[PDB]
Design an enzyme around this catalytic site. Structure first.
Site, PDB file in Angstrom:
ATOM      1  N   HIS A 134      -2.764   2.313  -1.929  1.00 37.84           N
ATOM      2  CA  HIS A 134      -2.869   3.256  -0.825  1.00 37.84           C
ATOM      3  C   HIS A 134      -3.686   2.797   0.388  1.00 37.84           C
ATOM      4  N   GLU A 174      -3.326  -0.228   1.354  1.00 35.92           N
ATOM      5  CA  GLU A 174      -2.294  -1.136   1.855  1.00 35.92           C
ATOM      6  C   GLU A 174      -1.350  -0.446   2.825  1.00 35.92           C
ATOM      7  N   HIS A 232      -2.184  10.084  -6.813  1.00 42.14           N
ATOM      8  CA  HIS A 232      -1.007  10.892  -6.537  1.00 42.14           C
ATOM      9  C   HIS A 232       0.290  10.128  -6.743  1.00 42.14           C
ATOM     10  N   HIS A 233       0.224   8.809  -6.932  1.00 38.49           N
ATOM     11  CA  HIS A 233       1.368   8.055  -7.416  1.00 38.49           C
ATOM     12  C   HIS A 233       1.563   8.205  -8.918  1.00 38.49           C
ATOM     13  N   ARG A 268      15.691   6.596  -9.510  1.00 41.94           N
ATOM     14  CA  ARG A 268      15.483   5.346  -8.794  1.00 41.94           C
ATOM     15  C   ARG A 268      15.845   4.149  -9.663  1.00 41.94           C
ATOM     16  N   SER A 327      -5.259 -15.388   2.471  1.00 40.08           N
ATOM     17  CA  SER A 327      -4.991 -15.440   3.907  1.00 40.08           C
ATOM     18  C   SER A 327      -5.441 -14.167   4.617  1.00 40.08           C
ATOM     19  N   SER A 328      -5.168 -13.004   4.016  1.00 42.73           N
ATOM     20  CA  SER A 328      -5.544 -11.737   4.636  1.00 42.73           C
ATOM     21  C   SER A 328      -7.055 -11.541   4.646  1.00 42.73           C
ATOM     22  N   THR A 363      -4.426  13.119  11.414  1.00 44.05           N
ATOM     23  CA  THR A 363      -3.213  12.578  12.028  1.00 44.05           C
ATOM     24  C   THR A 363      -2.653  13.529  13.085  1.00 44.05           C
ATOM     25  N   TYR A 403      -1.894   2.049   4.666  1.00 44.47           N
ATOM     26  CA  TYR A 403      -2.454   2.350   5.976  1.00 44.47           C
ATOM     27  C   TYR A 403      -2.691   1.093   6.789  1.00 44.47           C
ATOM     28  N   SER A 427      -0.384   3.908  21.826  1.00 42.48           N
ATOM     29  CA  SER A 427      -1.333   4.473  22.777  1.00 42.48           C
ATOM     30  C   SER A 427      -1.268   3.744  24.104  1.00 42.48           C
ATOM     31  N   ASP A 484     -11.794 -18.169  22.318  1.00 43.41           N
ATOM     32  CA  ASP A 484     -11.065 -18.283  21.061  1.00 43.41           C
ATOM     33  C   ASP A 484     -11.774 -17.485  19.965  1.00 43.41           C
ATOM     34  N   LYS A 504      -4.184  12.873  16.491  1.00 47.48           N
ATOM     35  CA  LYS A 504      -3.558  11.759  17.201  1.00 47.48           C
ATOM     36  C   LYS A 504      -2.210  12.151  17.799  1.00 47.48           C
ATOM     37  N   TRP A 560       8.545  -3.983  -7.657  1.00 48.05           N
ATOM     38  CA  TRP A 560       7.425  -4.394  -6.818  1.00 48.05           C
ATOM     39  C   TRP A 560       6.098  -4.147  -7.524  1.00 48.05           C
ATOM     40  N   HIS A 593      13.245  -7.962  -2.001  1.00 40.87           N
ATOM     41  CA  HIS A 593      13.342  -7.276  -0.725  1.00 40.87           C
ATOM     42  C   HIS A 593      12.091  -6.464  -0.430  1.00 40.87           C
TER      43      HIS A 593
HETATM   44  C1  HEA Z   1       4.196   3.861   5.028  1.00 41.75           C
HETATM   45  C2  HEA Z   1       2.945   4.262   4.867  1.00 41.75           C
HETATM   46  C3  HEA Z   1       2.673   5.559   4.238  1.00 41.75           C
HETATM   47  C4  HEA Z   1       2.297   6.718   4.886  1.00 41.75           C
HETATM   48  C5  HEA Z   1       2.053   6.946   6.351  1.00 41.75           C
HETATM   49  C6  HEA Z   1       2.139   7.694   3.944  1.00 41.75           C
HETATM   50  C7  HEA Z   1       1.791   8.969   4.171  1.00 41.75           C
HETATM   51  C8  HEA Z   1       1.491   9.872   3.215  1.00 41.75           C
HETATM   52  N1  HEA Z   1       1.716   9.669   1.886  1.00 41.75           N
HETATM   53 FE1  HEA Z   1       2.325   8.094   0.958  1.00 41.75          FE
HETATM   54  N2  HEA Z   1       3.655   6.864   0.309  1.00 41.75           N
HETATM   55  C9  HEA Z   1       3.787   5.585   0.749  1.00 41.75           C
HETATM   56  C10 HEA Z   1       3.058   5.108   1.802  1.00 41.75           C
HETATM   57  C11 HEA Z   1       2.735   5.863   2.872  1.00 41.75           C
HETATM   58  N3  HEA Z   1       2.435   7.206   2.670  1.00 41.75           N
HETATM   59  C12 HEA Z   1       4.809   4.861   0.025  1.00 41.75           C
HETATM   60  C13 HEA Z   1       5.279   3.450   0.261  1.00 41.75           C
HETATM   61  C14 HEA Z   1       5.256   5.710  -0.910  1.00 41.75           C
HETATM   62  C15 HEA Z   1       6.306   5.433  -1.948  1.00 41.75           C
HETATM   63  C16 HEA Z   1       5.601   5.040  -3.250  1.00 41.75           C
HETATM   64  C17 HEA Z   1       6.247   3.854  -3.922  1.00 41.75           C
HETATM   65  O1  HEA Z   1       7.194   4.037  -4.649  1.00 41.75           O
HETATM   66  O2  HEA Z   1       5.499   2.770  -4.148  1.00 41.75           O
HETATM   67  C18 HEA Z   1       4.507   6.935  -0.745  1.00 41.75           C
HETATM   68  C19 HEA Z   1       4.665   8.043  -1.503  1.00 41.75           C
HETATM   69  C20 HEA Z   1       3.850   9.106  -1.461  1.00 41.75           C
HETATM   70  C21 HEA Z   1       3.855  10.167  -2.327  1.00 41.75           C
HETATM   71  C22 HEA Z   1       4.804  10.352  -3.481  1.00 41.75           C
HETATM   72  C23 HEA Z   1       4.278   9.660  -4.735  1.00 41.75           C
HETATM   73  C24 HEA Z   1       5.270   9.861  -5.848  1.00 41.75           C
HETATM   74  O3  HEA Z   1       6.447   9.230  -5.806  1.00 41.75           O
HETATM   75  O4  HEA Z   1       5.121  10.776  -6.615  1.00 41.75           O
HETATM   76  C25 HEA Z   1       2.863  11.032  -1.934  1.00 41.75           C
HETATM   77  C26 HEA Z   1       2.527  12.298  -2.580  1.00 41.75           C
HETATM   78  O5  HEA Z   1       1.380  12.661  -2.711  1.00 41.75           O
HETATM   79  C27 HEA Z   1       2.241  10.461  -0.818  1.00 41.75           C
HETATM   80  C28 HEA Z   1       1.230  10.936  -0.069  1.00 41.75           C
HETATM   81  C29 HEA Z   1       1.228  10.787   1.292  1.00 41.75           C
HETATM   82  C30 HEA Z   1       0.783  11.753   2.276  1.00 41.75           C
HETATM   83  C31 HEA Z   1       0.240  13.134   2.052  1.00 41.75           C
HETATM   84  C32 HEA Z   1       0.956  11.188   3.478  1.00 41.75           C
HETATM   85  C33 HEA Z   1       0.576  11.820   4.797  1.00 41.75           C
HETATM   86  O6  HEA Z   1      -0.343  10.947   5.454  1.00 41.75           O
HETATM   87  C34 HEA Z   1       1.685  12.145   5.793  1.00 41.75           C
HETATM   88  C35 HEA Z   1       0.932  12.715   6.999  1.00 41.75           C
HETATM   89  C36 HEA Z   1       1.864  13.162   8.093  1.00 41.75           C
HETATM   90  C37 HEA Z   1       1.750  14.351   8.627  1.00 41.75           C
HETATM   91  C38 HEA Z   1       1.269  15.519   7.811  1.00 41.75           C
HETATM   92  C39 HEA Z   1       2.200  14.575  10.045  1.00 41.75           C
HETATM   93  C40 HEA Z   1       1.074  15.259  10.817  1.00 41.75           C
HETATM   94  C41 HEA Z   1       1.637  16.314  11.732  1.00 41.75           C
HETATM   95  C42 HEA Z   1       0.959  17.401  12.002  1.00 41.75           C
HETATM   96  C43 HEA Z   1       1.282  18.181  13.246  1.00 41.75           C
HETATM   97  C44 HEA Z   1      -0.039  17.953  11.017  1.00 41.75           C
HETATM   98  C45 HEA Z   1       0.332  19.397  10.683  1.00 41.75           C
HETATM   99  C46 HEA Z   1      -0.476  19.890   9.509  1.00 41.75           C
HETATM  100  C47 HEA Z   1       0.108  20.297   8.409  1.00 41.75           C
HETATM  101  C48 HEA Z   1       1.371  19.639   7.924  1.00 41.75           C
HETATM  102  C49 HEA Z   1      -0.620  21.238   7.489  1.00 41.75           C
HETATM  103  N4  HEA Z   1       2.862   9.267  -0.475  1.00 41.75           N
HETATM  104  C1  HEA Z   2       8.902  -2.883   4.398  1.00 42.54           C
HETATM  105  C2  HEA Z   2       9.484  -1.695   4.506  1.00 42.54           C
HETATM  106  C3  HEA Z   2      10.918  -1.519   4.226  1.00 42.54           C
HETATM  107  C4  HEA Z   2      11.975  -1.889   5.028  1.00 42.54           C
HETATM  108  C5  HEA Z   2      11.858  -2.541   6.372  1.00 42.54           C
HETATM  109  C6  HEA Z   2      13.154  -1.541   4.401  1.00 42.54           C
HETATM  110  C7  HEA Z   2      14.430  -1.736   4.816  1.00 42.54           C
HETATM  111  C8  HEA Z   2      15.530  -1.151   4.271  1.00 42.54           C
HETATM  112  N1  HEA Z   2      15.507  -0.535   3.055  1.00 42.54           N
HETATM  113 FE1  HEA Z   2      14.044  -0.181   1.857  1.00 42.54          FE
HETATM  114  N2  HEA Z   2      12.752  -0.650   0.518  1.00 42.54           N
HETATM  115  C9  HEA Z   2      11.411  -0.644   0.751  1.00 42.54           C
HETATM  116  C10 HEA Z   2      10.895  -0.407   2.009  1.00 42.54           C
HETATM  117  C11 HEA Z   2      11.477  -0.919   3.102  1.00 42.54           C
HETATM  118  N3  HEA Z   2      12.862  -0.955   3.169  1.00 42.54           N
HETATM  119  C12 HEA Z   2      10.671  -0.974  -0.453  1.00 42.54           C
HETATM  120  C13 HEA Z   2       9.180  -1.124  -0.586  1.00 42.54           C
HETATM  121  C14 HEA Z   2      11.589  -1.109  -1.432  1.00 42.54           C
HETATM  122  C15 HEA Z   2      11.350  -1.449  -2.880  1.00 42.54           C
HETATM  123  C16 HEA Z   2      11.334  -0.205  -3.764  1.00 42.54           C
HETATM  124  C17 HEA Z   2      11.269  -0.641  -5.205  1.00 42.54           C
HETATM  125  O1  HEA Z   2      11.136  -1.808  -5.476  1.00 42.54           O
HETATM  126  O2  HEA Z   2      11.108   0.274  -6.172  1.00 42.54           O
HETATM  127  C18 HEA Z   2      12.874  -0.878  -0.815  1.00 42.54           C
HETATM  128  C19 HEA Z   2      14.064  -0.913  -1.460  1.00 42.54           C
HETATM  129  C20 HEA Z   2      15.205  -0.435  -0.928  1.00 42.54           C
HETATM  130  C21 HEA Z   2      16.388  -0.205  -1.582  1.00 42.54           C
HETATM  131  C22 HEA Z   2      16.637  -0.434  -3.049  1.00 42.54           C
HETATM  132  C23 HEA Z   2      16.242   0.845  -3.790  1.00 42.54           C
HETATM  133  C24 HEA Z   2      16.027   0.565  -5.253  1.00 42.54           C
HETATM  134  O3  HEA Z   2      16.497  -0.429  -5.748  1.00 42.54           O
HETATM  135  O4  HEA Z   2      15.571   1.546  -6.044  1.00 42.54           O
HETATM  136  C25 HEA Z   2      17.299   0.280  -0.669  1.00 42.54           C
HETATM  137  C26 HEA Z   2      18.685   0.643  -0.966  1.00 42.54           C
HETATM  138  O5  HEA Z   2      19.219   1.556  -0.380  1.00 42.54           O
HETATM  139  C27 HEA Z   2      16.636   0.342   0.565  1.00 42.54           C
HETATM  140  C28 HEA Z   2      17.082   0.714   1.781  1.00 42.54           C
HETATM  141  C29 HEA Z   2      16.752  -0.021   2.894  1.00 42.54           C
HETATM  142  C30 HEA Z   2      17.622  -0.406   3.988  1.00 42.54           C
HETATM  143  C31 HEA Z   2      19.085  -0.080   4.126  1.00 42.54           C
HETATM  144  C32 HEA Z   2      16.868  -1.119   4.851  1.00 42.54           C
HETATM  145  C33 HEA Z   2      17.348  -1.700   6.167  1.00 42.54           C
HETATM  146  O6  HEA Z   2      16.558  -1.144   7.219  1.00 42.54           O
HETATM  147  C34 HEA Z   2      17.282  -3.228   6.268  1.00 42.54           C
HETATM  148  C35 HEA Z   2      17.583  -3.641   7.715  1.00 42.54           C
HETATM  149  C36 HEA Z   2      16.331  -4.087   8.440  1.00 42.54           C
HETATM  150  C37 HEA Z   2      16.100  -3.783   9.699  1.00 42.54           C
HETATM  151  C38 HEA Z   2      16.846  -2.653  10.360  1.00 42.54           C
HETATM  152  C39 HEA Z   2      14.838  -4.285  10.354  1.00 42.54           C
HETATM  153  C40 HEA Z   2      14.956  -5.778  10.665  1.00 42.54           C
HETATM  154  C41 HEA Z   2      13.613  -6.302  11.107  1.00 42.54           C
HETATM  155  C42 HEA Z   2      13.499  -7.254  12.004  1.00 42.54           C
HETATM  156  C43 HEA Z   2      14.536  -8.340  12.095  1.00 42.54           C
HETATM  157  C44 HEA Z   2      12.564  -7.039  13.164  1.00 42.54           C
HETATM  158  C45 HEA Z   2      11.550  -8.178  13.273  1.00 42.54           C
HETATM  159  C46 HEA Z   2      10.341  -7.695  14.035  1.00 42.54           C
HETATM  160  C47 HEA Z   2       9.936  -8.279  15.136  1.00 42.54           C
HETATM  161  C48 HEA Z   2      10.886  -9.074  15.986  1.00 42.54           C
HETATM  162  C49 HEA Z   2       8.563  -7.984  15.674  1.00 42.54           C
HETATM  163  N4  HEA Z   2      15.338  -0.136   0.436  1.00 42.54           N
HETATM  164 CU   LIG Z   3       0.083   7.081  -1.845  1.00 47.42          CU
END
Ligand code: HEA
Ligand code: HEA
Ligand SMILES: [Cu+2]
Ligand SMILES: CCCCCCCCCCCCCCCCCCCC(=O)O[C@H](COC(=O)CCCCCCCCCCCCCC)COP(=O)(O)OCCN
Ligand SMILES: CCCCCCCCCCCCCCCCCCCC(=O)O[C@H](COC(=O)CCCCCCCCCCCCCC)COP(=O)(O)OCCN
Ligand SMILES: [Zn+2]
Lengths: 117, 100, 535, 48, 58, 126
Positions: free
Chosen positions: C243, C245, C292-293, C440, C159-160, C318, C247, C258, C94, C321, C129, C64
């Site tokens: 990380h 990825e 930080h992971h 987890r 592909s990417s 951010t 973004y 926008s 094209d 924006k 994963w 999943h």
């Molecule tokens: C989906 C894409 C995505 C995005 C957008 C981000 C956004 C950020 N992530 Fe990442 N992150 C992931 C992907 C992403 N992350 C994923 C998938 C995980 C799970 C890891 C996994 O298990 O593999 C993870 C988990 C994760 C962790 C936990 C790691 C762990 O489990 O220990 C951390 C901690 O450092 C982190 C960092 C951040 C930070 C600081 C941001 C920031 O960019 C968030 C920024 C948002 C804002 C801050 C809003 C801005 C609003 C304002 C008005 C600013 C105001 C100013 C202040 C707040 C001072 N991320």
């Molecule tokens: C890609 C981002 C993503 C998405 C979409 C989701 C979708 C959901 N995820 Fe998350 N989830 C992850 C990120 C994401 N998850 C990741 C990375 C893991 C793995 C973590 C691990 O391996 O450690 C995970 C695993 C995970 C687990 C298992 C946790 C574990 O085993 O430790 C669970 C269980 O509660 C959960 C919750 C859900 C639920 C209820 C949804 C529901 O939202 C599902 C329903 C889906 C929809 C609501 C959207 C349908 C989309 C389309 C049909 C739209 C198509 C688009 C176009 C037409 C343009 N997710």
């Molecule tokens: Cu990160």
């Protein structure tokens, strides 16, 4: 496949742009080996004629319905982007003039007419 | 950077040169898109501009936009006691007197 | 024969985007049913649907993750919206390398087959994963499952890479007559800034995966600690891809929002140069932080302090924006159509899911939240409610132009509200379960974690109903879609102004800032014969 | 032949079998494969 | 005639009415073994990935 | 230019074809060239309704009979999921620990070895 051109006044298609041949024991020149849209640029640049233009839109005078800006095209439509008479005042607004209707640019007001060549 | 006394001259010059209905509505549309409300002199030019192109609904819709641009109700009635000889000479009726 | 030379042996860039959409729909259905399988097992304490098998729970979670990080969000955000819209926005006929576009499509159906065949020949691939080295060896997973799953991450990488080089090469020298690279629209900048990270991140992943393969099957011992290696090296070589990825998944969303904010609120975007500089800063500061992971692996005390400092800095670009989107929506007139509903539901939920990232950035606070459901609740508010919402908004924005057939407004609104309610019910008690201490990747849990798991199993059944209603919306779009343009005025791209009369508006209907909405709507196969002109 | 039903890989109107069957079977396979995978791997490991 | 057949094959690849990969009277020798052996290579990896899901080894 | 053609255009304008609509506009555009105060009240109302009125492209996106449809479509989307989730709730595997007489024996052990001093301890959830 037919008679070879010497200048771009004798080029009526892709059938006039094959050219003569090189000789045995010589690195060939581009005037002895070129066929397609490459030789057409070559025969343009040894005279001074730019075949593929890169000159932007007229940004000098406005557009009245009596005296409109003439945009030249080989089709019935051409996409024209207006951004102002001092060339950066108006934002980017795109328009499609046609041979049956003139565009008029809802913010600043210039009128564009299509000249069919 | 533009001041009130330059806005109220530039839009008079623009309103005194329109030739079609598209142009009158174009200058009227971006006149009500600033922080400055139009002067009573500019609106008096806009009704003559609407008279030259011979349109009636635009001369009514100018007075309806003043009710939305102006902050209160007293200022709106202060606009309507000075734009009165313009209305009763050309003949423009407001929306609340027509009930359309 | 004409079927083959036009939908299998193709050159046109816009005809591969529709195939990308059809592939992405299938690969987003499969993972959602796999998520429903997981959430119907994590409902009440005991062993309910999977009888006693803790394998075929980790396999479902792995499959999943992979089917929606690699097979849904990237093909939709790169293939359907990047291949189709970027030549029309920059004004090209094209792409520069069309055969590479065709191979970048056709490498993915052989990548689906190997992943689906990594779950039938054996116990399976329950490595998670992140395919960590000492579990995914030949002592726990001894079979052709992990090997066929790390060959599905090579073809997607190729592909990417081939798509990203095409995107960078096209926008440099295939523009129109009067466009410099400062008058480009924001979506082109989003695609460029994700295509640079695709170059700079994927070799490290390919190297780490290949060295894991050599450790598994050619007894090389890069990451085995009985020969002089460390597993932690792999973690470095994974997260340097990881990380960038995350973004890559979110930058093409931003630009889409926008356009909607620029359209249905009739104002230009506040500070476009600040926005492209903010995207550049976000793209650059996603490469200087990856550790930080990994705060609990045993790093130094002077290295955690660097990675807490370099992580909270990303909040500054951010916010520019977000506040610029608010300043764009402030002054103008707002009409609530079905793209702007998803636009409004993106500016609030990305903020909520992103403010949790500041709490997790500290190394002192990560001792209480690592490998806990707080992380899951953090990244589901941003992945499911930030990227999928942008995808739905982009579909409901650009589908009448591409297809030529309109849709029912009411059913789309019902779908949006069902998604909103069900997804906000599903991922919010995960924060409470994380704060109380639930780890987890566990099938069975102690009896204290029962009650919230009863509530998060209820929203998933709401969201699947919304997916089925989306299927019916597509069916009602394709059949009798010519007669769905007089039901509502949502079909109009822009509304009449205050002074603009209806008779004047019917003559001059479309006012735009791009080339997109002035085309005939089926777009022509060869759409530019004579070049476009910009002053 | 450029028109509103020309850029799609599948035929929609003037068709022998109505479009509801190919539209439904696509989603049926898409939401039926990952139950078949779980059935196979459950039956290979003893449990029912 | 001479080694400059370049001015002769450029009048053949233009005005051909066949695709480029099957225009010369030599492309049979390249295209028949390649498409012949590709249909064996694909048909062998769809027999050994279905035999292997049933547990049969060699 | 009869009274019947002009009066009460608010209930007939959307039903006329596009060749009986371009004759009324082209007959009110040679009537506006006359000086005003010579126009009837019906022509003044019609000239306002033709250009600035709630027909055609000035209709609202949502009518009053559409928000009710969206509300009662969301309710029958929430009721179905509740009935589906209830069916997976009666047929559960309940382990032996989830009973009240077992979660009252755990409280004595958590009371003797002092646990949760500040907030609360209670394992009873029936
Ligand atoms: C989906 C894409 C995505 C995005 C957008 C981000 C956004 C950020 N992530 Fe990442 N992150 C992931 C992907 C992403 N992350 C994923 C998938 C995980 C799970 C890891 C996994 O298990 O593999 C993870 C988990 C994760 C962790 C936990 C790691 C762990 O489990 O220990 C951390 C901690 O450092 C982190 C960092 C951040 C930070 C600081 C941001 C920031 O960019 C968030 C920024 C948002 C804002 C801050 C809003 C801005 C609003 C304002 C008005 C600013 C105001 C100013 C202040 C707040 C001072 N991320
Ligand atoms: C890609 C981002 C993503 C998405 C979409 C989701 C979708 C959901 N995820 Fe998350 N989830 C992850 C990120 C994401 N998850 C990741 C990375 C893991 C793995 C973590 C691990 O391996 O450690 C995970 C695993 C995970 C687990 C298992 C946790 C574990 O085993 O430790 C669970 C269980 O509660 C959960 C919750 C859900 C639920 C209820 C949804 C529901 O939202 C599902 C329903 C889906 C929809 C609501 C959207 C349908 C989309 C389309 C049909 C739209 C198509 C688009 C176009 C037409 C343009 N997710
Ligand atoms: Cu990160
Ligand atoms: C390793 C995978 C990446 C290698 C690809 C490098 C390609 C560099 C050369 C290049 O960019 O040209 C394109 C492909 O050429 C080529 O060199 C074709 C290489 C294709 C290799 C495919 C990957 C197999 C593994 C042109 O391709 P074009 O035909 O669109 O040019 C159309 C106009 N003449
Ligand atoms: C309770 C269960 C859910 C029921 C939802 C029913 C919503 C239907 C009403 C609706 O859609 O209203 C539109 C959005 O309004 C709104 O303003 C809703 C807020 C929109 C942002 C929501 C994202 C957070 C108005 O749209 P309208 O402009 O045509 O109303 C024209 C008059 N002014
Ligand atoms: Zn302009």
């Amino acid at each position: 496949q037919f008679k070879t051109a010497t200048s771009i006044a004798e080029v009526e298609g892709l059938e006039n742009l094959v050219g003569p041949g090189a000789k045995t024991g010589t690195v060939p020149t581009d005037l002895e080996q070129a066929t397609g849209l490459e030789r057409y640029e070559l025969l343009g640049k040894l005279e001074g004629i730019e075949v593929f233009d890169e000159t932007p839109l007229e940004a000098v005078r406005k557009g009245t319905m009596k005296d409109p800006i003439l945009i030249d095209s080989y089709d019935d439509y051409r996409y024209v982007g207006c951004t102002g008479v001092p060339a950066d005042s108006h934002n980017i607004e795109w328009l499609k003039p046609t041979t049956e209707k003139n565009a008029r640019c809802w913010e600043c007001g210039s009128v564009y007419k299509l000249n069919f060549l | 950077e533009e001041t009130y006394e330059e806005f109220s001259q530039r839009y008079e010059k623009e309103f005194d040169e329109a030739y079609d209905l598209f142009e009158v509505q174009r200058v009227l549309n971006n006149c009500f898109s600033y922080d400055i409300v139009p002067s009573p002199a500019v609106i008096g030019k806009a009704l003559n501009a609407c008279r030259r192109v011979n349109d009636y609904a635009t001369a009514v819709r100018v007075f309806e936009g003043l009710k939305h641009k102006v902050e209160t109700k007293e200022q709106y009635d202060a606009y309507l006691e000075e734009l009165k000889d313009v209305r009763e000479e050309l003949g423009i009726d407001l929306k609340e007197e027509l009930f359309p | 024969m004409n079927y083959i030379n036009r939908w299998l042996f193709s050159t046109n860039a816009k005809d591969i985007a529709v195939l990308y959409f059809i592939f992405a729909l299938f690969c987003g259905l499969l993972g959602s049913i796999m998520s429903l399988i997981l959430r119907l097992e994590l409902s009440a304490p005991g062993n309910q649907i999977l009888m006693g098998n803790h394998q075929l729970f980790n396999v479902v979670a792995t499959a999943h993750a992979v089917l929606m990080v690699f097979f849904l969000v990237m093909p939709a955000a790169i293939g359907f919206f990047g291949n189709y819209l970027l030549p029309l926005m920059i004004g090209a006929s094209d792409m520069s390398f069309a055969r590479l576009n065709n191979i970048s499509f056709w490498l993915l159906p052989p990548a689906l087959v190997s992943l689906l065949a990594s779950a039938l020949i054996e116990n399976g691939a329950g490595t998670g994963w992140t395919v960590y080295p000492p579990l995914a060896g030949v002592q726990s997973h001894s079979g052709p499952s992990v090997d066929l799953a790390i060959f599905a991450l090579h073809l997607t990488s190729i592909s990417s890479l081939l798509g990203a080089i095409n995107f960078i090469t096209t926008t440099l020298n295939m523009r129109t007559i009067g466009m410099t690279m400062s008058k480009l629209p924001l979506f082109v900048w989003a695609v460029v800034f994700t295509s640079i990270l695709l170059l700079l991140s994927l070799p490290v992943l390919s190297a780490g995966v290949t060295l894991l393969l050599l450790d598994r099957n050619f007894n090389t011992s890069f990451f085995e600690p009985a020969g002089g290696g460390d597993p932690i090296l792999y973690q470095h070589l994974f997260w340097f891809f990881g990380h960038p990825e995350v973004y890559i998944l979110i930058i093409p969303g931003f630009g889409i929002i926008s356009h909607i904010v620029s359209t249905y609120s009739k104002k230009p975007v506040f500070g476009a140069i600040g926005m492209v500089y903010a995207m550049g800063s976000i793209g650059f500061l996603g490469l200087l932080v990856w550790s930080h992971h990994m705060y609990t692996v045993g790093l130094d005390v002077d290295s955690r302090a660097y990675f807490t400092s370099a992580t909270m800095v990303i909040a500054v670009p951010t916010g520019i924006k977000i506040f610029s989107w608010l300043a764009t929506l402030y002054g103008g007139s707002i009409r609530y159509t079905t793209p702007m509903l998803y636009a409004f539901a993106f500016l609030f939920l990305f903020t909520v899911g992103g403010l949790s990232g500041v709490v997790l950035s500290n190394a002192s606070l990560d001792i209480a939240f690592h490998d806990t459901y707080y992380v899951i609740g953090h990244f589901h508010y941003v992945l499911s409610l930030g990227a999928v919402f942008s995808l739905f908004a982009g579909y409901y924005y650009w589908s009448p132009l591409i297809t030529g057939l309109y849709y029912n407004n009411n059913l789309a609104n019902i779908q949006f509200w069902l998604l909103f309610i069900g997804t906000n019910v599903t991922f919010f008690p995960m924060h409470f379960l994380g704060l109380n201490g639930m780890p987890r990747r566990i099938p069975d849990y102690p009896d204290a974690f029962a009650g919230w798991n009863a509530i998060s199993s209820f929203g998933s059944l709401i969201s699947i109903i919304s997916v089925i209603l989306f299927a019916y919306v597509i069916y009602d779009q394709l059949v009798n879609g010519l007669t769905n343009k007089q039901l509502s005025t949502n079909s109009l791209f822009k509304n009449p102004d205050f002074i603009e009369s209806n008779i004047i508006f019917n003559d001059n209907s479309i006012k735009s800032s791009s080339i997109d909405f002035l085309l005939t709507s089926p777009p022509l196969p060869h759409t530019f014969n004579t070049p476009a002109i910009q002053s | 032949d450029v028109g509103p039903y020309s850029n799609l890989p599948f035929k929609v109107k003037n068709r022998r079998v109505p479009y509801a069957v190919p539209h439904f079977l696509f989603f049926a396979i898409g939401m039926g494969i990952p139950f078949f995978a779980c059935y196979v791997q459950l039956k290979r490991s003893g449990s029912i | 005639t001479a080694t400059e057949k370049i001015i002769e094959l450029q009048k053949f690849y233009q005005s051909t009415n066949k695709p480029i990969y099957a225009a010369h009277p030599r492309s049979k020798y390249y295209l028949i073994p390649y498409f012949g052996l590709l249909g064996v290579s694909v048909a062998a990896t769809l027999f050994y990935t279905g035999r292997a899901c049933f547990g049969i080894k060699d | 230019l009869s009274n019947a053609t002009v009066t009460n255009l608010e209930k007939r304008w959307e039903d006329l074809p596009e060749t009986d609509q371009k004759d009324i506009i082209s007959q009110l555009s040679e009537r506006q060239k006359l000086p005003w105060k010579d126009l009837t009240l019906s022509e003044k109302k019609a000239a306002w309704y033709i250009s600035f009125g709630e027909w055609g492209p000035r209709r609202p996106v949502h009518t009053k009979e559409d928000k009710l449809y969206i509300f009662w479509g969301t309710v029958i989307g929430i009721v179905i999921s509740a009935t589906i989730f209830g069916a997976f709730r009666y047929n559960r595997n309940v382990p032996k620990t989830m009973n009240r007489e077992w979660q009252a024996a755990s409280d004595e052990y958590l009371k003797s070895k002092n646990a949760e001093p500040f907030t609360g301890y209670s394992q009873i959830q029936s």
